[PDB]
Each structure stands twice: as structure tokens, then as C-alpha cells.
Amino acid sequence: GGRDLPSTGFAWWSGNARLINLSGKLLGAHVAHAGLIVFWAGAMTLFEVAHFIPEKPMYEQGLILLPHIATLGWGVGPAGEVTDIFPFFVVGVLHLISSAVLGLGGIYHALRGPEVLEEYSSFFGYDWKDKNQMTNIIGYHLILLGCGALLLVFKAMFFGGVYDTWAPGGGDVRVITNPTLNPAIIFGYLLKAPFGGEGWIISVNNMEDIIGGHIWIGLICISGGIWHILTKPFGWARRALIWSGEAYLSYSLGALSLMGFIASVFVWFNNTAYPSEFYGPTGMEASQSQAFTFLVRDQRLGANIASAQGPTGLGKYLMRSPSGEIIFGGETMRFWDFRGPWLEPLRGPNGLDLDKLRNDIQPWQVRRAAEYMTHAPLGSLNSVGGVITDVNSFNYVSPRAWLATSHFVLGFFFLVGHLWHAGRARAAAAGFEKGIDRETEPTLFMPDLD
Amino acid sequence: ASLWEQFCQWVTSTNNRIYVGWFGTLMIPTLLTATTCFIIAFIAAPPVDIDGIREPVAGSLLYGNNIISGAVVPSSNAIGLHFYPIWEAASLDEWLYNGGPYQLVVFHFLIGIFCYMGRQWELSYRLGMRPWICVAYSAPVSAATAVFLIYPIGQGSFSDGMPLGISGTFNFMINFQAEHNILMHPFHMLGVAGVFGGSLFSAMHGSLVTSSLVRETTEVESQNYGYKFGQEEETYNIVAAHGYFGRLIFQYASFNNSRSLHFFLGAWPVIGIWFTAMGVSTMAFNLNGFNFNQSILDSQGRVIGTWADVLNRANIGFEVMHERNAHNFPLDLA
């Protein structure tokens, strides 16, 4: 394998392109990178644990990995309070140790092992143009991916459960016993409009639906893996697609960009898979919590929060949504589709219920609204929390902000990568990725436009 | 030879005066719909209740606006992120009052410009060109998506999208500075680097080529007539340009490779606009610019102001007056 520009045609800054047809060294690069990923998981988790203050809420400490563990129902109890730090520590250590095994394997394959696996094995040797084998690899991975989804299912059903923020009697780890197998609900979720009030799959709001989804996902992924191992690409797909390593990279880049945008939206809007007791309030929650907090204060001062018109003529604390639902007043009117386990007790069939808002408020609801309102996912780049005009004494940026901003940026740059590699794969398949041939420049044989 | 094949050949034809392509079969209807609705709205649309407090804003020329002040007003805050097509309104007048033209125009525009990017790739493919002009075009596409789609999504309302007008754009920027301190965001700083440098390099390259043109004309005619469209030979001496520029600064700060130079010219503003688009896109989730308010304290603990504190006073002034009737609670949470 050439490791210079004269032997490969690729400069040092495009050096990893020299691995396109070196399957052994490419496999080494891949396993060592996987090692990097697992290393970060373990090391960052151990950092978060060493920096963790167990009594202080998770979203106040710059944590993004321990919230993921706690949502899975490890190390936490009711309302997300930490019972034991050891499960987080164990998760970190196991990732950190496995990272070394993957690093070794990667450095081995990248440096010492065969540069090309074609000779060595028919099983591991692949040619980019060999559609049957590339679909075999798709299939083996689809079966492991579906197995991982079923691993989530098993943890939620048979191995202690997962954190259900919607649990009766307060949020807590719950064992899911009736996951939603009904394909109408599960796939209906896929068919919901990605706009306010519906939210496509972002609006999944119960662990039963999430778990039933992962049973379907595991089943569909395992079936698709078996299909791809026992089949070959059909004619229409053989004709509409580019069959090359860079092409497959560009396809995966498009998929990754889509998933990055989706993850950004998920963490920003959904509080079921991302519980607010770990991730802090969504911005919709913080706005509604502000409206609620001053609803309670003013009501306790004796105001009629129902019949109090604001300076504009709309109700100061309560109004109607454009479809008539009773909602919180003020600019929060935009977040009237927000659902939260501390709010939903005060909602009637018509929306917010006056009888409930006048008699059934609880101190935990007021405390929760105060906490969520003061932890609005608003903050500066140097982590000065609250609105940008505030002074420097509050060190807080929401984990939702960090995760959403990061994955939007990564999704966008991966869309750019998709375009880069998809256009390059197309041009290289067609044979003009290196520039225009002077003798057969196509425009010289095309008629003038005018 | 089939009729579908004939249609495919026409669509992908490189002999059409304007290339259509498959991406064009989407670009043309969407952009035409957006242009028609935009012109009609900008001229004649009735006032729009942007802030959802029943305080309609006049955006159209016939309602008292000039070209500078006119705009297509974003849809009502009461709508939030809800999808609001014409067939969800009980009358066109209700649709207009709530800012439906904004949703129609922006959605069709966004689709149209993504299709324009795809179309650029498509024609490059049909012409046997290299494929990355669309990558450069993805920078303005990203910025437009940031202001028309991502920022509204993060803030929770299409009412927070950039208005389709000049003074509406300034309002958007001012409000954005007041709530996000975009001037003190490093990604905006890279965007300013991108645009200042893009203009700097455009001027530099243009001036160096123009300075180094090969003598081809007489003093009575435009020097541009010394170039003939389609000529084999280069029209300026890059060696002379490099000698001048490498003496203006130092030899190693000057390009001798036109390919390397034209790459740099493309990459610098494109990267800078990608950063600024991502900056606007991340302040959509309220990850704002740097906060240095009361960062410097003396020994007793008294605040020594800096220029950032004066900037913060300007921001507070903007913030307390914006949407003067829309806030009922002390904190502007969105």
C-alpha cells in the first residue's frame, strides 16, 4: 500500500483515501476509531463520576452521559435521586477497558496485519463492487443492531426497567410489562406531521410506546439482516445507485446527518426518553413553568387568574389556543402543546382546569415549576446561565442545549460530507472527478444555448 | 424510445436554455409558488398579528409601507410551530390575519433552494464537471435555513423567523443581539471574518489579475476586449502577479498555483458562512455569545466595567423595549 503522493495520487491531507482499496488497513482504521469512541465513553463517564455531586441535580453539573445511564434505570431511584454511584462507575470502566482491546486490534490491523483481506479470507475479504458480499456485511450488522435494540427491551422488561418520568406517584424506575405492540400506534408515530402539536416521532410520550418500538425495530432489523444475507440487490437498485466505497460512505453520511438532526430535535423537545429530572427542563417546560409559577403566586395574592385580562386584552394567565384549548397566557402561548408530568395533573379534557388550578396545586408542583423556570435552557458560551443580559454569578448551561447544538452542527457538517462524497462518487464513477479532458470536453460538442 | 424515456431525456437535457433536471422538476414549482405569493403579499397583504396579542403589523406596500419598511410578516406566535396551510383557515382573511403567506413562502422557498443545490450538482454531472459548486452554495443555504427554519424551531415559533423584508431583517438582528449577544459569539466572528476576508480576497484577486493583464488592446478600447471567450491562452501573467504580491508581503505569503489560490478563494468565505450559520443555528437553542458582565472586580469586590458591560447596557435597552406588549412574566424564556 502506497503511503505517499507519487504512489497513490492522494496528498497527505487526503491520506485516509489511500485506504479505500486496502481492506485490512481500512479495517484497522475502523477498529481503532471504534476504540476511540468507546474510550471516550468510558473516560468521559469516569470524569463525570469524579466530578459528580450526588445530591445536586444532574443537569446542574455539565453531565451528558450519566443522564443516559440514569434513564436506563441504573444508580437512581424515585424522582431521579442517586442511590449508588457504582453503576455509572462500572459502565465507565467497562468501556475504558474494552477501548484498549479495540485500540490493540486496530493498531494491529492498521500496522501489522494483512493490508488486503481478499487473499486471506472469502468471508472477510470484500470488493466494493461485490454487491452480494456488501449486502452480507449490511445483514450481519443489521442483526447485531436489532440485537442491541432488543437489549434495550430486555433491560426495560426483565432487568430492572427504565426511568419513567410519567410514573404514577412521581417519576421512578419502572419495569415495562405491556409494551405497545399495536403496529397502528407504533407506525402511526412515523406518519405524524413534524410540526407543532404532532411532532412526528419526537412526540413519543410513554415508555410502553418506546419499548414496543424497540421490539419492532429489533424484529425489522433482524429480518432485514437475514434478507440482505440471503438476497442480492435487485435490478432497479443496481441501476439507480452508485456501487463504490465512496458512494457507500456518502450514503452513510446522509443517514448520519438525518439522525443527527433527529437527535437534536429529540433532546430539545422530548422529556420522556430525556427525563427533565436528569436533562433539566425543555425550553417549552421552562416557559410553561414561568407562566405557572406566577399563576400560583398571583392567585395566592388573591388575583382571579381566570378573569384577569392582560394589557393586550388576552388573558394574563390563561387564554385559548387557536383550537380552543385552555392554555397558559403570555408568549408561552407558543408552547401550549407542552406535556409534563407536573403539569398534566392540572389539565382537564378542555385543557387547564380552573377547579384544579384553584384547589389541587401541590407544593412539589410549585417547587418543580420554580426549579424548571430558573433552569431554562438559556445560557452563554462561557456557561453564564439565564438570559444573556444577566451578570456573572450563575454557572449553568442546560445539557439539552449542549446536546442539541452539538448534534445539529454535526448533522449539518455530515450533510455537507454526504454532498462532498456523493458528488465525488458520482464523478469518479463517471470518470471526470480529476477534471475535464481537453480533447473530449463535452461542452465543445454541445450546441449553443442561443 | 418510450414516452417516459423521452421525457427523461428532455428533463435531463443539457441543451435546454435553462437546465431543468429532476431537482428542477421540484425547484421550479416551489420557487415559482414562493415568488408569486411573496410578490402578492408584499404588495397587498393585510396586517399580520405576528406577536399573537391582536396587534397586527402592516407589512405590505398598499397598507402604508415603503420598499424599505415593507415585509411579509412571520406567522402569529399563537400558531407557534403548527403547520398552517390555506386549507386550515376558515377564510383566506383569517389565513392572512395570522400570517399564512409567511409559512407558504418560506416552506416553498426552503424546498426550492435545497433543490437549487441539488440542481447545481445535477448539471455539473451532466456537463462532466467536478461536483462541488453545490458544496459552496450550501453555505448560504445553511444560513437561510438557520434564519427561516432552525431558529424558529429552537425558539418554538415561526413568529421568531426572519421577516421577509429589509426593516424586518434589522428587527430580527436587533432582537437577536438583545437575546443572544451574537456580536460576542465566536461563530458570528468567523462569519465576519468570512465576509470581510471574502471581500478582501475578491478585491485582491480581481486587482492582481487586472494589474497583470497581457497587453492585447489599444488605449482607445476597453481592456476587456483583450480577452476572447473560449481562448486557449491565459489573459494575465500569474508570474507577474506573484512577483508583485510576494514583494508586497514576502515571497512565501503569495500563491504561485492558481488551483491552490482558487481553492482558498472558495473555501474561506464558504467556511466562514458555515460557522455563522451554525452560530445562528445554535443560538436557536439559546447557547448564546460570550457573557463577560461583571467579570472584572476590584479587591473590595466592586465591578469595574469593560466594553462588554457597555454592550450589555445596549442589549438591555434593546431587550426591555422589544415586543413591548407581548411579555406578561419577568423572564423572556423564548
Binding site: 449553443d448 444555448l449 442561443d450 | 404588495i43 406596500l61 415603503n66 420598499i67 471567450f229 473560449g230
Partner: peptide
């Protein structure tokens, strides 16, 4: 009536665009 002025200048701009595209000087290889 300032509306008439604004529409007229905008229309002039758009019509110039149409003519510049539909009836441009045809680039020729010489």
C-alpha cells in the same frame, strides 16, 4: 400613489432581468 412608484421601479428591475436572460448577447467561440 408612492405605491405606484415602488411597484414601477420593482417591475423595471424584474423586466430587465427577463430581457437580460431571454435576450442576452449570445456567447460565441471565436
Amino acid at each position: 400613489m408612492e405605491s405606484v412608484a415602488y411597484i414601477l421601479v420593482l417591475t423595471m428591475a424584474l423586466a430587465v432581468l427577463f430581457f437580460a436572460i431571454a435576450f442576452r448577447e449570445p456567447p460565441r467561440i471565436e
